[PDB]
Amino acid sequence: MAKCPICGSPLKWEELIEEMLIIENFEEIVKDRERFLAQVEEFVFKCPVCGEEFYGKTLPRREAEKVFELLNDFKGGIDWENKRVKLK
Ligand SMILES: [Zn+2]
């Protein structure tokens, strides 16, 4: 689970992958954990609760280990044609 550093409202990790699955380079980033964690810290995200932008470099050190879990737990409930992402 992700939290906003401006308002402090709950965010889902399944919504971030589903909204960012519109890029063709994403199929190459999903195979390497070192490129996915470095891209989240360098890129900024928008909050639908407050409206202000938050960076992946200002997030906690325990949530960064949760990103390794989506990359490692591949094949099962992830479809490219139907655009469905599952997190365990
Ligand atoms: Zn917010």
Tab-separated table of C-alpha atoms and ligand atoms in Angstrom:
chain	number	residue	atom	x	y	z
A	1	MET	CA	0.000	0.000	0.000
A	2	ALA	CA	1.094	3.555	-0.979
A	3	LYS	CA	0.421	6.776	1.031
A	4	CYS	CA	0.254	10.470	-0.175
A	5	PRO	CA	3.065	12.851	1.459
A	6	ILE	CA	0.655	15.910	0.907
A	7	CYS	CA	-2.789	14.675	2.284
A	8	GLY	CA	-2.035	11.112	3.630
A	9	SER	CA	-4.887	9.154	1.884
A	10	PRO	CA	-4.636	5.232	0.906
A	11	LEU	CA	-3.485	4.216	-2.627
A	12	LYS	CA	-3.537	0.820	-4.451
A	13	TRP	CA	-0.398	-0.678	-6.215
A	14	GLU	CA	-2.794	-2.398	-8.817
A	15	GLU	CA	-4.074	1.126	-10.040
A	16	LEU	CA	-0.431	2.434	-10.732
A	17	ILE	CA	0.489	-0.633	-13.040
A	18	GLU	CA	-3.022	-0.567	-14.862
A	19	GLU	CA	-2.756	3.278	-15.587
A	20	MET	CA	0.947	2.978	-16.740
A	21	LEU	CA	0.347	-0.160	-19.058
A	22	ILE	CA	-0.255	2.282	-22.090
A	23	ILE	CA	3.589	2.464	-22.907
A	24	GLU	CA	5.314	-0.138	-25.267
A	25	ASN	CA	8.722	0.172	-23.339
A	26	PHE	CA	6.864	-1.123	-20.110
A	27	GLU	CA	7.095	-4.802	-21.458
A	28	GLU	CA	10.986	-4.372	-21.304
A	29	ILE	CA	10.964	-2.583	-17.780
A	30	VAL	CA	8.670	-5.431	-16.192
A	31	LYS	CA	11.557	-8.006	-16.872
A	32	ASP	CA	14.191	-5.938	-14.844
A	33	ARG	CA	13.521	-4.845	-11.146
A	34	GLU	CA	16.601	-2.401	-11.185
A	35	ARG	CA	15.002	-0.344	-14.120
A	36	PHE	CA	11.374	-0.370	-12.578
A	37	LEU	CA	12.494	0.943	-9.019
A	38	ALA	CA	14.868	3.624	-10.618
A	39	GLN	CA	12.001	4.827	-13.002
A	40	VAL	CA	9.363	5.175	-10.071
A	41	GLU	CA	11.960	7.345	-7.989
A	42	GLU	CA	12.876	9.545	-11.111
A	43	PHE	CA	9.186	10.009	-12.299
A	44	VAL	CA	6.377	11.968	-10.520
A	45	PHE	CA	2.732	10.728	-9.849
A	46	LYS	CA	-0.655	12.593	-9.413
A	47	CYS	CA	-3.059	12.209	-6.404
A	48	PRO	CA	-6.963	11.776	-7.276
A	49	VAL	CA	-7.868	12.713	-3.544
A	50	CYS	CA	-6.019	16.131	-3.208
A	51	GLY	CA	-4.681	16.845	-6.791
A	52	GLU	CA	-0.920	17.604	-6.013
A	53	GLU	CA	2.137	15.679	-7.499
A	54	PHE	CA	4.337	13.291	-5.384
A	55	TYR	CA	7.764	11.682	-6.256
A	56	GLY	CA	8.899	7.967	-5.890
A	57	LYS	CA	12.209	9.211	-4.227
A	58	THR	CA	10.193	10.667	-1.198
A	59	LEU	CA	8.453	7.192	-0.542
A	60	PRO	CA	9.438	4.727	2.529
A	61	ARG	CA	12.332	2.109	2.334
A	62	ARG	CA	9.880	-0.830	3.228
A	63	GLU	CA	7.445	-0.060	0.226
A	64	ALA	CA	10.471	-0.297	-2.289
A	65	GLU	CA	10.834	-4.087	-1.294
A	66	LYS	CA	7.030	-4.559	-2.233
A	67	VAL	CA	7.918	-3.490	-5.936
A	68	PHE	CA	10.368	-6.613	-6.137
A	69	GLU	CA	7.250	-8.849	-5.266
A	70	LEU	CA	5.107	-7.823	-8.428
A	71	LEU	CA	8.217	-8.428	-10.731
A	72	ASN	CA	9.045	-11.861	-9.002
A	73	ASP	CA	5.364	-13.135	-8.837
A	74	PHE	CA	4.862	-13.169	-12.677
A	75	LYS	CA	2.402	-15.573	-14.622
A	76	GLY	CA	-1.034	-16.351	-13.066
A	77	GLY	CA	-3.450	-13.363	-12.871
A	78	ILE	CA	-1.809	-10.834	-15.332
A	79	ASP	CA	-3.357	-10.388	-18.851
A	80	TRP	CA	-2.068	-7.994	-21.625
A	81	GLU	CA	-5.257	-8.278	-23.901
A	82	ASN	CA	-7.817	-7.789	-20.990
A	83	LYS	CA	-5.479	-5.261	-18.955
A	84	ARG	CA	-5.791	-7.081	-15.525
A	85	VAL	CA	-3.047	-6.871	-12.804
A	86	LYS	CA	-3.060	-8.952	-9.532
A	87	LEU	CA	-0.950	-8.436	-6.349
A	88	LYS	CA	-0.483	-11.064	-3.584
B	1	ZN	ZN	-2.995	13.430	-1.872
